[PDB]
């Protein structure tokens, strides 16, 4: 295999851990460092030119962080588990004025992951697909990233057909959480740009750099 699911799963395992908006932002900044470590352990990522590694993560980071804390939250009720160890409940999120986007994360991502019991190899592969985004602007070789995307979802199809043979639509189902992910990532990003613009919230240096 040019893209074995074993190594993608290891990537995930290797990086395994009062204003709620402040908490969320501390966690996000913490996990930005862990994101870079994760990406390097995805097969072939580190072999890309540094400029393209930068473009993919600049393009992907918000969706990659959202995919993690969503999957990490499956066993939680009406709330998310942060990397800091702190659970945030929808009541808290609503009371800080981020209820709507918070409800979207619960209903479109967390719930859907719990319902189908999305395993960690599957989270891995979805995040790998999101990382290898051939639509990212300025890539020196979009075909290369497209071909890496192709190898990830071919391995994912085969993992699903083998591991859950009883669920013939599981592969499609996994791929059909990516639009919601794109959508929630863009609304989250619009919120962080607002927290920044306003100076309501402490934005640590690496989060800050991803918002410039």
């Amino acid at each position: 295999m040019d893209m074995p699911v074993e190594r993608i799963l290891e990537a995930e395992l290797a990086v395994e851990p009062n204003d709620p908006v402040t908490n969320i932002c501390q966690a996000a900044d913490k996990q930005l460092f862990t994101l870079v470590e994760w990406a390097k352990r995805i097969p072939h990522f580190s072999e890309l030119p540094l400029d393209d590694q930068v473009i993919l993560l600049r393009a992907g980071w918000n969706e990659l962080l959202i995919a993690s804390f969503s999957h990490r939250s499956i066993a939680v009720k009406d709330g998310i588990l942060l990397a800091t160890g702190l659970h945030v409940h929808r009541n808290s999120a609503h009371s800080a004025g981020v209820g709507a986007i918070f409800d979207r994360v619960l209903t479109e991502l967390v719930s859907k992951m719990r319902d189908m019991q999305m395993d960690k190899t599957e989270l891995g592969c979805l995040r790998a697909i999101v990382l290898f985004n051939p639509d990212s602007k300025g890539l020196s070789n979009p075909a290369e990233v497209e071909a890496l995307r192709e190898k990830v979802y071919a391995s994912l199809e085969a993992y699903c057909k083998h591991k859950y043979p009883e669920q013939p639509g599981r592969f499609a189902k996994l791929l059909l959480r990516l639009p919601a992910l794109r959508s929630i990532g863009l609304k989250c990003l619009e919120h962080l740009f607002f927290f920044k613009l306003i100076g309501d919230t402490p934005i640590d240096t690496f989060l800050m750099e991803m918002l410039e």
Partner: peptide, 13 residues
Amino acid sequence: KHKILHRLLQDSS
């Protein structure tokens, strides 16, 4: 000038 991202991405670890 993505200073912090560039530095984390070079480091061989």
